[PDB]
Amino acid sequence: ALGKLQDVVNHNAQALNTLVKQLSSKFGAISSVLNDIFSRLDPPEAEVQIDRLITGRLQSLQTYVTQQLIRAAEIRASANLAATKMSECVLGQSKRVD
Amino acid sequence: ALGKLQDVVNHNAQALNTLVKQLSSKFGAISSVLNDIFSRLDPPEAEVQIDRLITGRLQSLQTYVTQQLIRAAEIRASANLAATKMSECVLGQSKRVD
Amino acid sequence: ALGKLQDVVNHNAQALNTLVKQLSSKFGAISSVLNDIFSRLDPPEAEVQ
Amino acid sequence: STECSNLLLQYGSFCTQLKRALTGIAVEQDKNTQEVFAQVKQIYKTPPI
Amino acid sequence: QCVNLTTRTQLPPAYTNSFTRGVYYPDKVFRSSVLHSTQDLFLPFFSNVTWFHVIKRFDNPVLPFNDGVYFASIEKSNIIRGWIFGTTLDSKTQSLLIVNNATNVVIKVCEFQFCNDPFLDMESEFRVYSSANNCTFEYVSQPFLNFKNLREFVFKNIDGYFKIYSKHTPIDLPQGFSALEPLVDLPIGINITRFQTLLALHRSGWTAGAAAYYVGYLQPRTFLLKYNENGTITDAVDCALDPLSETKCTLKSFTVEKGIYQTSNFRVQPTESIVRFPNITNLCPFDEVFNATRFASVYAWNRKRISNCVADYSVLYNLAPFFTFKCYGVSPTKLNDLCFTNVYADSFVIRGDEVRQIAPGQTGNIADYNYKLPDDFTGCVIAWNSNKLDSKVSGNYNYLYRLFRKSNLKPFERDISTEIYQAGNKPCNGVAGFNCYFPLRSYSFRPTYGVGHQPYRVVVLSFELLHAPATVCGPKKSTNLVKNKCVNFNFNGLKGTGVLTESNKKFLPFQQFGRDIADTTDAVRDPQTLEILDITPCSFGGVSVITPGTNTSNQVAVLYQGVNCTEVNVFQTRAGCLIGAEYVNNSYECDIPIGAGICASYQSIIAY
Amino acid sequence: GTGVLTESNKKFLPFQQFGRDIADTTDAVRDPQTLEILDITPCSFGGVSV
Amino acid sequence: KGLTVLPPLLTDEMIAQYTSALLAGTITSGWTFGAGPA
Ligand SMILES: *[C@@H]1O[C@H](CO)[C@@H](O[C@@H]2O[C@H](CO)[C@@H](O)[C@H](O)[C@H]2NC(C)=O)[C@H](O)[C@H]1NC(C)=O
Ligand SMILES: *[C@@H]1O[C@H](CO)[C@@H](O)[C@H](O)[C@H]1NC(C)=O
Ligand SMILES: *[C@@H]1O[C@H](CO)[C@@H](O)[C@H](O)[C@H]1NC(C)=O
Ligand SMILES: *[C@@H]1O[C@H](CO)[C@@H](O)[C@H](O)[C@H]1NC(C)=O
Ligand SMILES: *[C@@H]1O[C@H](CO)[C@@H](O)[C@H](O)[C@H]1NC(C)=O
Ligand SMILES: *[C@@H]1O[C@H](CO)[C@@H](O)[C@H](O)[C@H]1NC(C)=O
Ligand SMILES: *[C@@H]1O[C@H](CO)[C@@H](O)[C@H](O)[C@H]1NC(C)=O
Ligand SMILES: *[C@@H]1O[C@H](CO)[C@@H](O)[C@H](O)[C@H]1NC(C)=O
Ligand SMILES: *[C@@H]1O[C@H](CO)[C@@H](O)[C@H](O)[C@H]1NC(C)=O
Numbered sequence A, B: 001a002l003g004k005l006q007d008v009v010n011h012n013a014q015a016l017n018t019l020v021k022q023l024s025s026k027f028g029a030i031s032s033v034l035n036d037i038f039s040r041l042d043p044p045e046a047e048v049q050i051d052r053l054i055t056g057r058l059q060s061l062q063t064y065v066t067q068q069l070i071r072a073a074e075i076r077a078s079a080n081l082a083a084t085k086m087s088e089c090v091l092g093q094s095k096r097v098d
Numbered sequence C: 001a002l003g004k005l006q007d008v009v010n011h012n013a014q015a016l017n018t019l020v021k022q023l024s025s026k027f028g029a030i031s032s033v034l035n036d037i038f039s040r041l042d043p044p045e046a047e048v049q
Numbered sequence D: 001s002t003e004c005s006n007l008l009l010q011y012g013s014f015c016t017q018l019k020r021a022l023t024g025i026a027v028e029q030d031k032n033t034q035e036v037f038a039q040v041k042q043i044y045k046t047p048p049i
Numbered sequence E: 001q002c003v004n005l006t007t008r009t010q011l012p013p014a015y016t017n018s019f020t021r022g023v024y025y026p027d028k029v030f031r032s033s034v035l036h037s038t039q040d041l042f043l044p045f046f047s048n049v050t051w052f053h054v055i056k057r058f059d060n061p062v063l064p065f066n067d068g069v070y071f072a073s074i075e076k077s078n079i080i081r082g083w084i085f086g087t088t089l090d091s092k093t094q095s096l097l098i099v100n101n102a103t104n105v106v107i108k109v110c111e112f113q114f115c116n117d118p119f120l121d122m123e124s125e126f127r128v129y130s131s132a133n134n135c136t137f138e139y140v141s142q143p144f145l146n147f148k149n150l151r152e153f154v155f156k157n158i159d160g161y162f163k164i165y166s167k168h169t170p171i172d173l174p175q176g177f178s179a180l181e182p183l184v185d186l187p188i189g190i191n192i193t194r195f196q197t198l199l200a201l202h203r204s205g206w207t208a209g210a211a212a213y214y215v216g217y218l219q220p221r222t223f224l225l226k227y228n229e230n231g232t233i234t235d236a237v238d239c240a241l242d243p244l245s246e247t248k249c250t251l252k253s254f255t256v257e258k259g260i261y262q263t264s265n266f267r268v269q270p271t272e273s274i275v276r277f278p279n280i281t282n283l284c285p286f287d288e289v290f291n292a293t294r295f296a297s298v299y300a301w302n303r304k305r306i307s308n309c310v311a312d313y314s315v316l317y318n319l320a321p322f323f324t325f326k327c328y329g330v331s332p333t334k335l336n337d338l339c340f341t342n343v344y345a346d347s348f349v350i351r352g353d354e355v356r357q358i359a360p361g362q363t364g365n366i367a368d369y370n371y372k373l374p375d376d377f378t379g380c381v382i383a384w385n386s387n388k389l390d391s392k393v394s395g396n397y398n399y400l401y402r403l404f405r406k407s408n409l410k411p412f413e414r415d416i417s418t419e420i421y422q423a424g425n426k427p428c429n430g431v432a433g434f435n436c437y438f439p440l441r442s443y444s445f446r447p448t449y450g451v452g453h454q455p456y457r458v459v460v461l462s463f464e465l466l467h468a469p470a471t472v473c474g475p476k477k478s479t480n481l482v483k484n485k486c487v488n489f490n491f492n493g494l495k496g497t498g499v500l501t502e503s504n505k506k507f508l509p510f511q512q513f514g515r516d517i518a519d520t521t522d523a524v525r526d527p528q529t530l531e532i533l534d535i536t537p538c539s540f541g542g543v544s545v546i547t548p549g550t551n552t553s554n555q556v557a558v559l560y561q562g563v564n565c566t567e568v569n570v571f572q573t574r575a576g577c578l579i580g581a582e583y584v585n586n587s588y589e590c591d592i593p594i595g596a597g598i599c600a601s602y603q604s605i606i607a608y
Numbered sequence F: 001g002t003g004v005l006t007e008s009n010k011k012f013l014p015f016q017q018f019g020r021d022i023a024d025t026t027d028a029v030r031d032p033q034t035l036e037i038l039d040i041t042p043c044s045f046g047g048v049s050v
Numbered sequence G: 001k002g003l004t005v006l007p008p009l010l011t012d013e014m015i016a017q018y019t020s021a022l023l024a025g026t027i028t029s030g031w032t033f034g035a036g037p038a
Helices: A003-024 A034-040 A043-090 B003-024 B034-040 B043-090 C003-024 C034-040 C043-048 D002-011 D014-037 E243-251 E286-290 E353-357 E365-369 G012-028
Strands: E014-017 E029-031 E035-042 E048-054 E062-064 E068-075 E082-086 E095-100 E105-110 E112-120 E126-132 E137-141 E149-158 E161-170 E181-187 E194-198 E211-217 E219-227 E233-238 E259-267 E273-276 E302-306 E324-327 E339-350 E379-385 E400-402 E440-442 E456-464 E486-491 E494-502 E521-525 E532-537 E540-547 E557-561 E570-572 E576-579 E592-595 E598-602 E605-607 F003-007 F018-020 F026-030 F037-042
Touching: A003 A043, A034 A043, A043 B043, A043 D014, B003 B043, B034 B043, B034 E494, B043 D002, B043 D014, B043 G012, C034 C043, D002 D014, D014 G012, E082 E149, E095 E112, E095 E126, E112 E194, E137 E181, E219 E243, E233 E243, E243 E259, E243 E540, E259 E592, E339 E353, E353 E365, E353 E456, E365 E400, E494 E521, E540 E576
Parallel strands: E029 F018, E273 E486
Antiparallel strands: E014 E048, E035 E219, E048 E211, E062 E194, E068 E149, E068 E211, E082 E095, E082 E194, E095 E105, E105 E137, E112 E126, E149 E161, E161 E181, E219 E233, E259 E540, E302 E339, E324 E379, E339 E456, E379 E456, E400 E440, E486 E494, E494 E532, E521 E532, E540 E557, E557 E576, E570 E576, E592 E598, E598 E605, F003 F037, F018 F026, F026 F037
């Protein structure tokens, strides 16, 4: 019955969960842990490895923010519809069919 | 007369054609063909070249998904409008001007 | 009173300003200026930067 | 390339994210068609005259 | 000491179902109340596990180790005592021995001279091996040990590390779940391809006690592991076993709701590899370039074209006299596997310290005024010391370099003009004088100088990659051509996986291969036969698993999207081929949407 | 790393040395000298708004 | 190259059938069918 709200909660929690899970991705580096890179490599190669992890995580974060913006636009449209229903169905009688 | 629907078909076909066309991009690598990269380089540098291709293609695919989601939001808004017109113009008589 | 239009103008101008300010970002390279890369490094590594 | 897929596994759930977003769009289009056209649960037919 | 056992009864080994056994902890990491996906060497669920009995039955064959071994033991009275691992099981190679006798657990790595039939026998008789010459590692550990005991072990040999995972259960194989705890991490660093278990006899000849063991093999796959609040693995999902578990693995949950889920993409795998190279074989004249008595000077470097030959570069790498064998646009070890055209050998002699300057993008004197390489250069630079041949005690002055020039050279440009240079404001008019110097000066090569100044012979091999018909190829042999089948082909260094078919594309005579919108090769001209083969990628499509809730049922159906039913309860839809659902001419409301007017429901799973 | 070390209620198995949480980050560690389990809560993080 | 077009759940003839049902309702019953029984 309440699938639409459950979907909103599930998509937000799933996006957050996926965003934290992306921290455990090597992104083509020797390790997903920055400390391992500091302890295992010299700074000339360490700068490259941290650069790879930073660009991968930054791309993941930008993807998450873009998904949040699109979902925010969808929820804003639904909220505008809900405000219209509150004004026209609750605060008055509507002649609009369905 | 039917420019809006043909326009939607054109955007979807053009987005797919662009996504296919983006495979022909070196993305700062020696070649745009992955098999050449394997057939030509040792894994320490071939891994870097394959990475360059993978990040370019993944950026292309995320870009395509992002415009697909934005177009999905636009088409969803248009479909919500069409459902409102079907409910209020076809299934009833509307006092709303225009 | 006119906050909504001022907000639209501010977001467009701020987005353009941020897009301008992103050109002064090295993005991991030795310099944000292309000319400095052509003059300070050899073409095998200047191509990468 | 099998080796490219093996290297692609190091990037995590990007592929799953893109497939899930496309699947959401795909079900959304069918939902849009249901919302627009399937507003009657009775299939009415015109009289023969 | 060895004893032949000749009282066996002939019987084939049995087979049974693995059920959900063979699961182990993938790592030393605690996890609590989570689902974790791992790609490791695992035993598939419900697999065909080999069954051996000890009852007059005495089953001790020697089995291949493969990539990993699951050993199950339905044991009472501890007949099974240990295992033997190795490659040849003799003194030629090195072998690993695991034993548990009456007192202590012994792990040894020695070159044992093993018996053909090794076994154990109060216990006061040990006939396992006759000799042990070179022992490199010893490890003494704790005791590992109606049928009462289930002993499950997993042996892996990854990166020279031999991992033993173990579990003991108080009890065919029982149906249930028991995770195997890691027991021994062993640093051996030896090759293991074959194993044999050790049994114990009972003497009163000999009598075999009642025991049963099972041997299974590990394959690389992904499991979805469930970890409870106490960190103990309680359930697992094999992602490649059945579509329902594939859906569970994809959704990262053990319960799947009713609906259709995109899980993976079916693609047919290649059956055999075909290599097509030109039939023409001519020994390539690398001897002329590399073994010549005299080389040209760096200002007048010699360029030789190499075409219409098969080149074996393996004889160049394995020889040790060349100090520098450095390749830029191609791997050194892949040169035998590729085909080239535009091959050039540029031979010259330079100093010891100038070998770094024969490279793309280098700043130097001979780089600018003698020999320039482009930024997009592909090929290999070869440099070796030639003090024995290109040096004289009185001074070898035959090699000259351009010290002075007005401007830097272009890539692959040779300057042999002996014109004077103007180094000052005053014009020189072709006559030497103040600030007027000859551009070409000779090297003072003497054998007494140290490294860095000694003469070095440098040969630059320049290639082009795949953008033309190739005439120089590696020693790889040409295979026959197969039509209408998925193969992984190699055409002149171009690797692909596809079906090779007849084509109706009218190629022009110069044209060799063809490229689609994406620029991946779609057609190719095969060497030796000159025919035009169309390349179509192998059959593939999306797999969707239509299922009701796992609370309701475990039955699933699969939809192969955009794939006709003849290229994979079979029903053909516009959406694709549906397997596992039975079409019903009755019409109901849509429960699980399939597409193209087709929906699925559970009543068995029906499609309507 | 950097974090607050607290006594842990987790029952690590003998092989297990370090522990991962819901999101696969290192939330528990076993001390190499005294075999006890310690949770590693991260140092407090806050968003400073003015 | 990995691109596929999934068919819509409602085919063109069924969408046409839905429009036919809406046309028959609005012609034979006016707006009554949209608010309850036709
Ligand atoms: C037990 O039987 C095996 C197999 O017949 C014997 O192994 C062979 O022994 C002969 C002795 O002349 C050798 O020539 C063969 O090379 C052996 N074969 C293998 C595969 O090793 C074994 O010697 C027997 N045991 C005893 C104690 O005689
Ligand atoms: C196991 O393998 C044997 C032969 O190796 C075969 O006869 C048997 O049918 C297999 N069992 C199953 C369940 O496939
Ligand atoms: C291990 O031995 C087998 C044969 O016993 C051989 O085929 C294989 O190449 C060897 N592997 C290594 C890594 O030495
Ligand atoms: C068990 O094996 C070890 C190692 O060879 C040996 O020292 C010990 O004496 C053996 N036990 C008996 C009872 O012989
Ligand atoms: C192995 O043993 C043989 C004979 O016992 C000996 O000649 C050989 O040198 C040994 N090799 C090593 C590596 O110990
Ligand atoms: C977890 O452990 C606690 C005590 O340590 C016990 O009460 C509980 O039953 C255990 N749960 C499971 C699922 O084993
Ligand atoms: C190389 O040249 C030397 C003499 O210059 C000759 O003796 C030798 O046989 C040659 N080797 C090859 C492989 O041509
Ligand atoms: C070998 O290849 C050439 C073209 O490179 C072709 O003309 C010739 O017929 C081929 N010969 C054989 C025996 O395949
Ligand atoms: C030394 O370490 C061992 C385990 O590594 C531990 O059991 C023992 O208590 C430690 N001793 C001291 C004095 O810390």
